[PDB]
Design a binder for this molecule. Sequence first.
Ligand code: HEM
Length: 154
Amino acid sequence: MVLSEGEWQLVLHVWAKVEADVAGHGQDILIRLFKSHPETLEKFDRFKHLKTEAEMKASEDLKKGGVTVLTALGAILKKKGHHEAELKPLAQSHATKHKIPIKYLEFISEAIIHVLHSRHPGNFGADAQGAMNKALELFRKDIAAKYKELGYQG
Ligand code: HEM
């Protein structure tokens, strides 16, 4: 699929606000995921034991994981669809080391969209959420295609 430059601009505009606090947004996103979809927590051998939202908030390991996720994702969006080199190593570790089903990527997408909506109401109106949703659906699509070539899912 293809995003127009205007949709890309919508996406990189909100993203620039995210980047004012990568660590905070990363915590919010992971916690939102793990609360909504507890089964995802189990994939994280280093976080698996955390029982409550308060423990999550206090974990320096979870905060570090969030920055990683967002830092990686940010590098992809900034490519505006020309993200083939970037997707390859991510698709390989997520399919063959971590074994992350596509379904779980949909879940974190929903969590990203939830947090932007709460923290940036002004820069995340309907048009901007439609564009981020498209950007994330592109990402998921391309990653699903890579999984299949690598021998996972599909
Ligand atoms: C926006 C989507 C995501 C991005 C950009 C992302 C990116 C990354 C990055 C850059 C790493 C470190 C290097 C590597 O192993 O590839 C990583 C590690 C990891 N990711 Fe993801 N990830 C995403 C989604 C997920 C989801 C949804 C899960 C599980 C439900 C997950 C589970 C893991 C695990 C288990 C590791 C290893 C953590 C540790 O033990 O160091 N990832 N991810």
